[PDB]
């Protein structure tokens with residue numbers, strides 16, 4: 059019997075809906091492709107810092123691991139999976155991770171047929187004063203990347219703990235790059251002209267997550283974090299709905 | 309003050325020297341290229357079961373198994389290897405076998421790529437059962453040359469294994485005075501003997517035949533080709549490898 063929370067449901071070029079729902083129901087709305095992003099008021103104002111100082115929080119992300127090639131990919135994978143082995147036991151315990159493992163019966167993503175080892179669960183991110191999309195299969199080194207299945211409804215979930223003075227949010231475009239190369243090419247176009255031609259007439263959503271707000275979104279859509287004037291602290295992970303169930307990783 | 313143990317020190321083509329030695333002294337002589345293999349009597353007849361039953365072992369992918377993978381299966385097996393090592397090593401750290409070396413040499417687990425330092429697997433227990441191949445061990449010998457991330461060879465890399473139970477056969481170890489240059493050279497010797505029975509270069513090479521007994525620790529330069537004989541009954545050993553890095557002695561399996 060699960061908590062229920064105010065939620066704003068966003069979809070490209072349609073009016074933002076206001077609803078009130080469980081974490082489970084928001085994630086299922088996303089997974090059914092009935093929303094592009096959903097912003098929920100999760101943590102009451104006097105309780106935010108405790109989610110950050112959660113004892114279970116005591117690095118290398120999948121997105122960083124993905125940018126690596128050749129021997130460097132093998133080495134950085136050793137580091138990524140070695141850290142995950144060290145930290146996930148505590149991470150499982152945090153309030154943040156438990157939102158998802160309670161609501162979905164989610165478990166850490168695992169790799170290996172013969173022994174199953176965990177991806178990293180989640181990270182706390184601090185921002186101090188270019189578009190990407192996240193897809194578990196988008197390693198730069200195609201031939202060596204071992205995750206080949208793309209999940210169309212891959213989700214990002216981040217809880218904002220401390221907002222910036224400028225109330226710097228997140229932009230998402232109705233544009234879903236087909237691979238890492240495709241994203242590298244747009245980067246190239248941005249760092250050669252400053253624009254991405256295709257983003258011009260592309261439908262878009264503006265999000266302004268506040269502290270205590272959990273933002274859930276389809277991460278395959280191109281998106282960017284606005285520049286902050288001030289300290290921004292978030293906690294984040296990603297979700298894919300695999301054949302064995304919901305799996306978390308970051 | 310360190311225990312000394314009876315030791316046989318072997319060098320190719322020459323009579324074995326008997327010496328009582330500490331673990332550090334045998335390791336230093338190997339690292340100095342003053343011996344090819346040393347066999348030491350470590351654990352007396354009361355106690356061999358205890359070293360195996362050590363709670364540090366309860367409760368693996370080996371580096372040599374990892375080295376056999378290529379491309380995406382290498383990235384995958386390495387996740388398994390390093391993800392597993394961290395579960396298993398806290399216990400292994402504690403085992404009297406591993407302590408034998410970490411006490412003697414101030415050895416630590418080998419780590420990779422230290423911004424974060426994650427551990428290699430420390431060691432293994434090995435059961436060999438009745439079975440109707442010549443290899444060498446060198447941390448650099450990944451089959452997939454471009455993607456294997458440990459590109460430095462250590463010429464004094466050591467293998468160390470304690471025998472716990474010997475086959476009825478008294479199956480032991482042969483080591484030749486031959487050091488293959490890479491994983492491909494070794495792979496070609498495997499192709500050669502499967503098509504030929506023998507290995508052209510081995511009939512010119514001196515060989516040391518070893519028969520280590522329960523309780524005995526065999527330390528040797530693992531870059532020399534070696535092979536364990538066919539066992540008639542179950543044989544049990546515990547093993548790891550050592551390299552002497554700029555930061556000190558490191559242990560991995």
Ligand SMILES: O=C(O)CCC(=O)C(=O)O
Nearest residue numbers: 434445467469536545547
């Ligand atoms: O466990 C043993 O008998 C020795 C195995 C071996 O070949 C090694 O130590 O590399």
Ligand SMILES: [Zn+2]
Nearest residue numbers: 191192214277
């Ligand atoms: Zn993202």
Ligand SMILES: [Zn+2]
Nearest residue numbers: 444445467530
């Ligand atoms: Zn060997």
